[PDB]
Structures are given as C-alpha cells and as structure tokens.
C-alpha cells in the first residue's frame, strides 16, 4: 500500500494477565480416608497431640 504505512517492528503487542494451570485429578482414594474404625485407610491423630516419633 501507499497510505500511512506503519513499520513491521513498530506494531504493538499485548500480554494477558490471566494464566492457565495444568489439571491434577485430585484423588481416587479421597472418600476412603477417615478417622473412624470402619474405614479402609484409617488415620491416627495421637501424635498430633503431645509428642512422639
């Protein structure tokens, strides 16, 4: 063209602020981890109290 002809290295760009993450697929063992006695994977909060190894 021969109108106002802007340069190739003078053309603007733009960078976005919103970023994407990668999917993780949380857990398939999550409904089965409880602290009661009739659970498959049983937890113990006895060392969350006073002390121990």
């Amino acid at each position: 063209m021969a109108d106002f002809s802007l340069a190739t290295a003078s053309q603007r760009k733009e960078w976005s602020n919103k970023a994407h993450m990668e999917y993780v697929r949380r857990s398939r063992f999550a409904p089965y981890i409880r602290n009661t006695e009739n659970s498959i994977f049983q937890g113990y909060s006895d060392l969350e109290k006073r002390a121990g190894d």
Binding site: A2, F4, S5, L6, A7, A9, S10
Partner: protein, 52 residues
C-alpha cells in the same frame, strides 16, 4: 524494552502539468529503535571484628 518510532521527510517530484492526485503514489518512511533495560547493583559489608 521500549521501542521508539521515527518518520522521515517526503521525497519525490511535483506532478507537473497534467498528472492526478490519484494516479501516482508515495510511501511515507518509518523506522524503529528499541532500548533494552537491565537490573544492576552494588553492596558493602560491615563486621564487628573491625568495628570495636
């Protein structure tokens, strides 16, 4: 970085006698200059073995 533009002057021949102002085109010249930017610094330490 930071890019700065420039426009030149105008160049051709005055369209003598008969010629249009729609036939015979010009471009307008245009250029760029980009300045890159960097971090830099300096520091000084002071002990206590050399201070009392």
């Amino acid at each position: 970085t930071l890019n700065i533009p420039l426009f030149y002057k105008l160049g051709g021949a005055p369209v003598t006698g008969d010629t249009p102002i729609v036939g015979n085109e010009t471009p307008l010249d245009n250029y760029n200059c980009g300045v890159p930017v960097a971090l830099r610094g300096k520091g000084v330490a002071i002990t206590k073995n050399q201070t009392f």
